[PDB]
Write a protein that binds this ligand. Structure first.
Ligand SMILES: *[C@@H](C)[C@H]1/C(=C/c2[nH]c(/C=C3N=C(/C=C4\NC(=O)C(C=C)=C4C)C(C)=C\3CCC(=O)O)c(CCC(=O)O)c2C)NC(=O)[C@@H]1C
Ligand SMILES: *[C@H](C)[C@H]1/C(=C/c2[nH]c(/C=C3N=C(/C=C4\NC(=O)C(C=C)=C4C)C(C)=C\3CCC(=O)O)c(CCC(=O)O)c2C)NC(=O)[C@@H]1C
Lengths: 859, 864
């Protein structure tokens, strides 16, 4: 490991402090520094000098008290008064390989221990803890503000390492006469892995002056090996880091590690001062405690993000069970939870003995035959390819395919049948600082000097998409596995290609849950390989047996006070036509091993023969998601103040919705007035919004994208606010580019007119009475490829007036915080755009109004 | 035990079915009944005979496959035909230690456990969508469920109490009979033998008490009788038969309510009484067994909720105990918001310290308290604390002079004649027994053969008598006296109950593990309970900072982030911010992991605003700390549920304005008036939705009554709205509709809330279509009839009738509809609210079964 020998064993310190290596046994010096002779005033000092008699008697007994401790971190910093000049000195004790070593820093102007120093921190920590969760950026901004108002540095920032080991400055609280560093990515080789393990062990590290001379320590002659000083607050930085800071335009740096707990180094809070800044060790230990609280909240939010990822994998497992209950593989594309909802993507294709099935932005049949022919010639062995960019993969015609179909994930099914997923190009620009990260860059300890340039240069990725993770390829391989199993009714290599690195072959585990299926008598119809492996019982021995009593009562032991009844109530509900999701299922292995599974029993409903049955899977989440699902299953029984009225609305409203859509379905017959026919179409698109809104509900998802005229949305949204402008007199102004016959834009008509309802109505809400209002939309049918087009649409819903209040836009732009009904609705309809390829800004001018950009795709 | 041999080995069956006890190896008849030859119609059944010659060859393989199976219970009941006459049977077969007894009940389908349980499933899901915290609603639901299933005349929940006597906690019966609800019964009515029978055969059916017990025959060489503990066909004990005759119970069906945890304890019985001889088929008895299993599940959930609510109150008394431990004066106990009366629930409290009587609530005068103190010095001097339920049974004269108020007493003795008193006023506990009154000395006599002739509801009042002091409340008192005893410096407890011996004990105290941190986080005060918990002694950890070394270095805290969490929360305790029940999992100096609940609050010296931080630990059972986790995450779940409701109301309101604008702009031209009727049906649905998400919060006495729109309407709108609201589910299920409605084109001036009428009408009619069978008709009958209240105030009476030809809507769902504030499904919930709207709107609804199930509802509105 490059620089590990140099940094740790390099005996050079900074001139602001004095380090004194003394063995605890008899206060005998085994090391010292050159500036100690000046800053102490000692002008007797040698190897063997009793330093207990070099200070006040109070600080003598304090130092020998701080020697004999379990942990010495609590003691730091002991207040030590010197004797040869009388000036008090902070004394940062820490134990090293053979002895301890003090670190004397002069004090300008009483902190006797860690707790007194932490008392400064606790106010900022209390401000940091009382923060809404689910937004790392707000937490980082709170940390940089707290560290700025504590330390008094010019520019503090949160450097965050990525998965590539390269970092990015994700927060800033700079002094405003400087330049912003937010967004600037730095290479991995900029900070060596030796320095990051150094920060894992040391966790706070200041310098005072980079242009200061490195004061060398005097190593003991008897021991050849140099001192392995890691936890010293005084040791000078490497000649490379010192020159680097001289080139950076910041001569004082306080960097402290953001550990996330086994001991992942998430990032670094790096402070920068333009002048030479010192800071007392009580304030430095306060900021180390502030970094402890930062790591605390950050781990509390990364665990929540990983639990949301596990919930998303559980949804993917339910989707694969949906795909298992389909009569043909052609049904997958035809039906509504299709192959483009399995994976976050933009198109999806299925080739099934010809008659190619495209969804969204997918190549035509000739183009996909070119893709298939490239997949047969190259990557012949590997069943799955997950290329970030087709151009990097080597497929000819990638330029002809365009940026729209740049990313492609394929899965091979038998008999030359292929499953495809397609992704459009992501317009991400990385403002690299000095040097772009090179994935071939290893740690080069023979490099003397760092680059002098730090002008950030934007690097734009030309024709590549979002990366394909292991989870999405896991889902793709699982669905490919079930489709090949269906093929047998009537080994797998996967190549991952990304722009930064090169083609790697990885075998992905399937994501199929353990599945059994029973008929009305609870006799086994199905018991798949996953369930066979989990329980240990083979399918053949348990097929035909009674699931409710035999197989799970004796054969595969259940667990609980009375669990079998809980099982027998559940499966009889499945046969009876009631489905339970994520019912807890603690059962034992054949070999006596506990499994804390989550049973889901769905009715095996079919056509008018074999009407009802049971299909069940056994999702096994981590025990923190067992807890996270128990804390919401122990909470629907308590919110009976409003869950009764929610189920009351969600059941009673269904009947006049069916009457509305049956009157409107029978009213489509013979209405030859095309103005009235379009008006009825507006009513059908209005009734549908209520049925989609009530039926889908809100739980923040799935988008039922279909072909629709875009002018059929404005006409379906001018009629919602038209009562609110007919009574408040807002004579509206429209100027459209006639997006009637702007056909086939791919998306939700319903969720788009719901977000435009909650934005337009909020705009017309806060207008002056008997006025006007402007709506306007500028479309540009930008061609993206040979045959692929996209229509980018702004929405200028412009109103002159007082406008929405300043707090309600932060209500809208929250993550989980709300105080108003209208604000809640605004927040949800903003998150609807955050789920669907667009965003929304609120601008404040002489007219207070909403910009709204949605990118939709004419097939 | 008493009667166990007589019941288990009493070779007597009931005559409603025959019984053959075959072998387990080669199908020989080890035993049989006298009425086997008459039931099978044989008029060969003898010693050691092959049993499969009696039944049909096709039925024979069912018996053999039942024998091969490891669990005989699942196959039961195997439908078995007869070879000599062609008669069906239910051959319920169970395994005994010396063979396999097969019980033949003549059938008049179901061949297994699953088919039987399918009947129970609807009632089981009825009592599982029920709100927790109560037991009366649960036991009042299960009796209607069993009355719907069994059909017995009177079904009641006979809950056992702690001294083995039982009372009818909930009873459902037809309105002809005597109400048994509240009636306590002596513990000798149900012997320990019967309880141990119910713990291994949980459904017992007596077809006829009067009917003679048919004798068994046995070919077994060994001298023992057949085993009939598990057999459904076992004759009741003669005493129990006489008992049933003397109660008016001709037939009975007693079902065990076994609750168990991880220890099966029989909670109570669901005895079903019939005023005539009745037998229900074994599908229904096995269904009722499964329903009793679900009932035991719901009772287990209610008992665990009660246990953790008691333990939450235990932690609340510990919090109040430390609140009364940090006081400068001993007299602060009497006068503060968390008073001594708050510690242990009581009518009054009294603290005697160096005389100077400190009364609270209802308390006896100083002379009276001095006299009772003199009595407590004269008797029970040796024991410190006394908690007499009644002072009259304690032995104290002048209890009548004290009156009802000072009857119940709880005493804590502190040194140098210092006392703590809690007083409870006389609670009028009047428990009407049935027949005899239970005494705790009454044992189950093994040779008694005749029950009591009487079962009349005679009262039994109590004396000057209070609510019983519990173990936990006396424990709270015990901890309070110990902490006050230590506070002054800075064991036998007698409990007297009016029905029991004066029990002498000493309970485990509730002083929580306490450490007190100063401003520099150094443990000033260290409790003996911390020394019991972590093992660290006080005089070794003294003078050491807690956050870093006493906790982190000495005790192994959680590795990822417990040390940072503890340091932040203790420095916030020193910063004035008190925190309650922080999750604090840690290890000890022995090494055993111990999760806890750190509560850290600021300590005040009364001259310094926040000098020091006080702390105390509570250690719960893991269900309680998980319930505190769900108490914390209620702030995320319940507000997101309310957020879902408010979001739904607003975002639904927007296209309702779009809907009414589209349907008030569609009024240009509708050429055929059928198109205008479809349009007006859509307008009615839109107004219906705008009223469903209007200003109502689902109470019907504050919102549905205060907001009730009153406008004129025309009834063809309502009828075509109902048909349009129903046609999608009609065409989904392939049904017919036969709307036998007269002409109401001319009744334009009927004046009532039409939108609520079409809401309730569609809810009723779509429940009918939801439970109408596949591919048949549904009838909509109306009969508009005149009704007169005045010459100009004339009303109307329309009777909506909805009929379907089949099994129809299940009885559980109508029970949910008429229960009022109880619902199982959201469909039954909407039916319940649409029933309450008809109750509010001068009408009434019925569900009538006349071999084709029909829905009947009337309503009254006045034309103008
Ligand atoms: C006479 C010897 C004593 C006696 C004996 C006895 N009792 C049983 C079984 C039961 N007794 C029950 C009592 C009740 N029945 C009710 O309806 C109510 C209240 C509403 C009560 C309190 C019940 C119940 C049973 C369970 C059996 C059943 O079918 O219900 C037995 C065992 C009989 C058997 O073979 O199963 C015996 C020996 N009971 C008496 O009261 C006198 C003191
Ligand atoms: C030498 C050829 C290479 C080198 C060596 C090097 N760097 C460190 C430690 C740090 N480097 C940091 C880089 C940044 N400083 C910033 O302000 C930003 C972004 C805004 C970045 C990316 C940081 C931070 C550290 C930690 C602070 C610290 O003092 O450690 C070290 C370890 C030195 C030590 O102190 O022991 C070394 C050997 N860096 C280079 O860029 C060249 C290629």
């Amino acid at each position: 490991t490059a620089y590990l020998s140099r940094i740790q064993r390099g005996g050079y310190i900074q001139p602001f402090g004095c380090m004194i290596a003394v063995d605890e046994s008899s206060f005998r010096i085994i090391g010292y520094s050159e500036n100690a002779r000046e800053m102490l005033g000692i002008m007797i000092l040698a190897m063997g000098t009793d330093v207990r008699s070099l200070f006040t008697s109070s600080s003598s007994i304090l130092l020998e008290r701080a020697f004999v401790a379990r942990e010495i971190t609590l003691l730091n910093p002991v207040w030590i008064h010197s004797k040869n000049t009388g000036k008090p000195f902070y004394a940062i004790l820490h134990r090293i390989d053979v002895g301890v070593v003090i670190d004397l820093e002069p004090a300008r102007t009483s902190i006797a221990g860690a707790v007194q120093s932490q008392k400064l921190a606790v106010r900022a920590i209390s401000q940091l803890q009382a923060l809404p969760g689910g937004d790392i950026k707000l937490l980082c901004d709170t940390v940089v503000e707290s560290v700025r108002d504590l330390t008094g540095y010019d520019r503090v920032m949160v450097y965050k390492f990525h998965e590539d080991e390269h970092g990015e400055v994700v927060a800033e609280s700079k002094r405003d006469d400087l330049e912003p560093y937010i967004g600037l990515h730095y290479p991995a080789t900029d900070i060596p892995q030796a320095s990051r393990f150094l920060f894992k062990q040391n966790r706070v590290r200041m310098i005072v002056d980079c242009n200061a001379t490195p004061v060398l320590v005097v190593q003991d002659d008897r021991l050849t090996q140099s001192m392995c000083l890691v936890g010293s607050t005084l040791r000078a930085p490497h000649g490379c880091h010192s020159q680097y800071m001289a080139n950076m335009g910041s001569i004082a740096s306080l960097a402290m590690a953001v550990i996330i707990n086994s001991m992942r180094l998430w990032g670094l809070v790096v402070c920068h001062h333009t002048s030479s800044r010192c800071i007392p060790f009580p304030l430095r230990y306060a900021c180390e405690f502030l970094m402890q609280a930062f790591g605390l909240q950050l781990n509390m939010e990364l665990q929540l993000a990983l639990q949301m990822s596990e919930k998303r994998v559980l949804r993917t497992q339910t989707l694969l069970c949906d795909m298992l209950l389909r009569d043909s593989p052609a049904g997958i594309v035809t039906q509504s939870p299709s192959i483009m909802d399995l994976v976050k993507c933009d198109g999806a294709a299925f080739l099934y003995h010809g008659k190619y099935y495209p969804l969204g932005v997918a190549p035509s049949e000739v183009q996909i035959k070119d893709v298939v022919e490239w997949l047969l010639a190259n990557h012949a062995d590997s069943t799955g390819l997950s290329t970030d960019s087709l151009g990097d993969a080597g497929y000819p015609g990638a330029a002809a395919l365009g940026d729209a179909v740049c990313g492609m994930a394929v899965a091979y099914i038998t008999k030359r049948d292929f499953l495809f997923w397609f992704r459009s190009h992501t317009a991400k620009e990385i403002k690299w600082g000095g040097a772009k990260h090179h994935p071939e860059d290893k740690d080069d300890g023979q490099r003397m000097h760092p680059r002098s340039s730090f002008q950030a240069f934007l690097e734009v990725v030309k024709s590549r998409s979002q990366p394909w993770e292991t989870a999405e390829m896991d889902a793709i391989h699982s669905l490919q596995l079930i489709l090949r199993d269906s093929f047998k009714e009537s080994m797998d290599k996967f190549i991952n290609i990304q722009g930064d690195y090169k083609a790697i072959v990885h075998s992905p585990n399937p994501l199929i849950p353990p599945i059994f299926a029973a008929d009305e008598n609870t006799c086994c119809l199905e018991w798949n390989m996953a369930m066979e492996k989990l329980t240990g019982w083979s399918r053949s021995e348990v097929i035909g047996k009674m699931i409710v009593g035999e197989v799970f009562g004796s054969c595969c032991m259940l667990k609980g006070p009375d669990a079998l009844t809980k099982f027998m109530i559940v499966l009889h509900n499945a046969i009876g036509g009631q489905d339970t999701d994520k019912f807890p299922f603690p059962f034992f292995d054949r070999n006596g091993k506990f499994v804390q599974a989550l049973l889901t029993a769905n009715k095996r409903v079919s056509l008018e023969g074999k009407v009802i049955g049971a299909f069940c899977f056994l999702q096994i989440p981590s025990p923190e998601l067992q807890q996270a699902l128990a804390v919401q299953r122990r909470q629907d029984t308590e919110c009976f103040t409003k869950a009764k009225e929610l189920a009351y609305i969600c059941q009673v409203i269904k009947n006049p919705l069916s009457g509305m859509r049956f009157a409107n379905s029978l009213l489509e017959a013979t209405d030859l007035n095309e103005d009235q026919k379009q008006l009825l179409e507006t009513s059908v698109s209005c009734e549908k919004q209520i049925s989609r809104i009530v039926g889908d509900m809100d739980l923040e998802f799935v988008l039922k994208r279909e072909e629709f005229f875009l002018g059929s949305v404005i006409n379906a949204i001018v009629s919602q606010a038209m009562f609110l402008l007919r009574d408040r007199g807002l004579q509206l102004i429209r100027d459209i580019p006639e997006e009637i016959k702007s056909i086939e834009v791919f998306g939700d008509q319903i969720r788009i007119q719901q977000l435009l309802a909650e934005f337009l109505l909020s705009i017309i809400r806060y207008a002056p009475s008997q006025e006007w209002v402007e709506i306007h939309l500028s479309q540009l049918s930008k061609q993206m490829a040979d045959g692929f087009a996209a229509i980018r649409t702004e929405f200028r819903m412009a109103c002159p007036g007082e406008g929405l209040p300043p707090e309600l836009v932060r209500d809208m732009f929250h993550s989980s915080r709300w105080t108003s009904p209208e604000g809640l609705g605004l927040s949800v309809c903003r998150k609807i755009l955050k789920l669907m390829n667009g965003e929304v800004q609120y601008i404040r001018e002489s007219e207070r109004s909403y910009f709204l950009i949605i990118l939709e795709l004419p097939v």
